[PDB]
């Protein structure tokens, strides 16, 4: 992944942090 400084795993951990947690 790459976003800013978030190279997170693949495609469960943007959904993941987005839908706990948006800002």
């Given at each position: 992944?790459t976003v ?6 693949r495609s469960d951990?943007?959904?993941k ?7």
């Amino acid at each position: 992944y790459t976003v800013p400084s978030a190279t997170f795993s693949r495609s469960d951990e943007l959904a993941k942090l987005l839908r706990l947690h948006a800002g």
